[PDB]
Amino acid sequence: EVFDVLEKLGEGSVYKAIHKETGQIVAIKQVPVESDLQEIIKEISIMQQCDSPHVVKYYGSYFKNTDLWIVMEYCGAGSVSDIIRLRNKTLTEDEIATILQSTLKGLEYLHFMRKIHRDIKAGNILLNTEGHAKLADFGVAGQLTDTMAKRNTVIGTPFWMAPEVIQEIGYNCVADIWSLGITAIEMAEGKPPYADIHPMRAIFMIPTNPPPTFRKPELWSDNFTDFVKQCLVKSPEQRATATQLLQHPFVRSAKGVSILRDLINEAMDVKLKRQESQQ
Amino acid sequence: VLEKLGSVYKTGQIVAIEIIKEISIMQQCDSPHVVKYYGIVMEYCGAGSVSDIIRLRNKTLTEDEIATILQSTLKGLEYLHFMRKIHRDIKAGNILLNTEGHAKLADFGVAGQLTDTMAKRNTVIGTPFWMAPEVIQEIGYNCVADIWSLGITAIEMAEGKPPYADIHPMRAIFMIPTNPPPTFRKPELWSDNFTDFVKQCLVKSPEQRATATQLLQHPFVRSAKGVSILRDLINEAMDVKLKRQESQQ
Ligand SMILES: CN1C(=O)c2sccc2N(C)c2nc(Nc3ccc(S(N)(=O)=O)cc3)ncc21
Ligand SMILES: CN1C(=O)c2sccc2N(C)c2nc(Nc3ccc(S(N)(=O)=O)cc3)ncc21
Structure with missing residues (x-):
């Protein structure tokens, strides 16, 4: 038994765990065997091909009770959506500027490597304890090659999907830039534009509607x-x-990771008090 | 206004509280098998949705419980389809049970209306795992698209989840028109x-x-027993909800 599997993480199939020999904390995703295992391998491969401090690391995999368990880098502060949900507060402009600067460095690295994340949203931007943002969940990520300069799969999470992804005309890395713009609105307002309507109705509106703006x-x-x-x-x-x-x-005017300390402390404190009452 | 039951919250009467469409279709309906619009103030169904009951008890439904719920659901569908309405979002989450055990069709947010000039709808809408192949194909569809969703809902009530539940929704939508009709897992x-x-x-x-x-x-x-066979199902689910609320205090 290499890992001591602890609680389920977040506000989900990822669990916190301790590597018994080293004491190191990891995050392990339990893949339900009914998943398309060919998609799981593309996911793992994309993570293996990335070596960046702004991209969640893949450590290894194991089979247990017919399930595939994927061992990954654990980020102490959780996702940006978890932090918004725990504090029940949207983020300040300074907090957003800092998180998006680290997110943009991860996107710059991925796009250099000809990878399209295709699922950028606050739920997939994770913060370590020190406040560094990491791109996570490569479940739907696409790979451009010498023979495939554009992808064609209509995939992602509808409110965050770029118009050209929905239009089926072929798209590239800048589809993540549109998702990043929706994520900026989501961090400032708590939800992306069209969050209160059906995701399939959003799919239809995005290519025809003018670009979304802030609600106020x-x-x-x-x-x-x-x-x-x-x-x-x-x-x-x-x-x-x-x-x-x-x-x-x-x-460019983003302050360091230091301005995220109170944001992270308050979110972790809510989580700890919530766990203490469950005992 | 009391607790949340999402965005729905719970004379002595208990009630549950684009947007015009959900209200218009609800006003045009007068059926005991369709949730009523009061003034958004709507009819409150005591036992919650079928998915809530499955989730609370952490148990799938028996064939007899499914037969009874689908018989009342089919009467609501028969009424809607007579009125030339397509619900377009049939799933266990939108089938609500009153305290007695009567199923009601709810959430007309994406419902469509056929008219003399519009014999078919064309909007690709619904929840991907429950959507009919012809809705996805963009060829024009009618009321029987709810019947396909009802078949997926029957699998969902028996297994806890629809077929292809572990496939990405957007990948599943693309395969539904070419896949053979889904079957039970066992x-x-x-x-x-x-x-x-x-x-x-x-x-x-x-x-x-x-x-x-x-x-x-x-x-x-046709062989569905009365609403009486749902009493234990409803009592056990409401008891779990009450014990969960008591610990939150
Ligand atoms: C490996 N990884 C992921 O790929 C993703 S992508 C979307 C979710 C995840 N999850 C859940 C994770 N949670 C964590 N860390 C973590 C730490 C604290 C909390 S919280 N907010 O519940 O206290 C959540 C996740 N660290 C890493 C991940
Ligand atoms: C008006 N109405 C709806 O249109 C729909 S459609 C999908 C959800 C709703 N909701 C939530 C509702 N919940 C209720 N009743 C109710 C009673 C108990 C519970 S439970 N299972 O949390 O105890 C949930 C809902 N009654 C009616 C609705």
Whole structure:
């Protein structure tokens, strides 16, 4: 028995665990055997091909009771959506600027490696205890190759999906940039645009509707609104890259990971008090 | 306004509290098998949804419990389909039971309306695992698209989850039109009548697919015992909910 499997993580099939020999904490995803095992292998391979501090690491796999268990890097503060849910508070512009700067470095790395995450959302941006954001959940990630310059699979989570992904015209890495723009709105408002309507109705509206904006635009700085606008350019050919968005005034002016300390402490404290009452 | 039962919250009368469409269709319906609109104030169903009952007890439903619930669900579908309405989101989560045990169709958020000029709808809408192949194919569809969703809901009540539940929704949507009709995971656990009922719901051709009126005459449905066989199911689910609420205090 290599791992001591502890509680289920988040607000789900990922569990916290301790490597008995080293004391090291890991996150282990329990794959239900009814999953398409060919998709699981593409996922694992994409994670193995990544060596970046801004991308969650894959450690290994094991079979137990017919299940495949995937051992991955554990990020102490949980996902951005978990932190929003635990504190019952949206994030400040400064907290968003800092998280999106680290998220953009992970996107820049992935896009250099010709990978499209295809599922960028606050739920897939994880923070370690020190406050560093990591791209996670490569379950739906796509790989561009010399023979495949564009992907065609209509996949992702509907509210965050780029118009060109839905249009079935072929798309590339900048589809993650549109998802990043929706994620910025989600971190500021608690939910993406169209969250209250059916996801299949959102699928139909996204290619025809003008780019989404903040629900109350007057509440946000000009740099934040312009950053969201640059992410949500409907033409993928004209859309800014992760490298270019790292130079946007909203991102360039991001304070260090130090400004996330209170955010992380308050969320972890809520989680600990919730666990203490369950005993 | 009391506790949440999502975005729905619980004279002495208990009630449950694009947007125009859900209300318009609900006002046009006057059936004991369809949730009523009061003024969004709606009819409160004591036992919650079928998925809530499965989740609370951590148990799937027996063939007899499914036969009884689907008989009342089919009467609601027969009423809607007579009124030229397509629910488009039939799943256990949208089948509600009152305290007595009567099933009601709920959540008309994505419901469609056929008219003299519009004999078929074209909107690709619903919840992917429950969506009919013709809805996904964009060829135009009618009321029997709810019958396919009902067949998936029968599998969902018996197994706890619809077929392809561990496949990505967006990948499942693309395969449904080319896949053969789904079956039970362990067919040997079920009677010839239940497996044939599911097979009649999951006929890929919508033109050949049985109507709600015809399925009310299927041996699996026709032989449904009264609402009395649901008493223990409802009492056990409500008891779990009450004990869960008591520990939260
Ligand atoms: C490996 N990994 C993942 O790929 C993803 S992607 C979406 C979710 C996950 N999960 C859940 C994870 N949770 C963690 N850490 C962690 C720590 C604390 C909490 S919390 N907020 O419940 O206290 C959640 C997750 N660390 C890493 C992951
Ligand atoms: C009006 N209405 C609805 O349209 C729908 S459609 C999908 C959900 C709803 N909701 C939640 C409702 N919950 C109820 N009753 C109710 C009673 C008990 C419980 S439980 N299982 O949490 O104890 C849930 C809902 N009664 C009615 C509804």
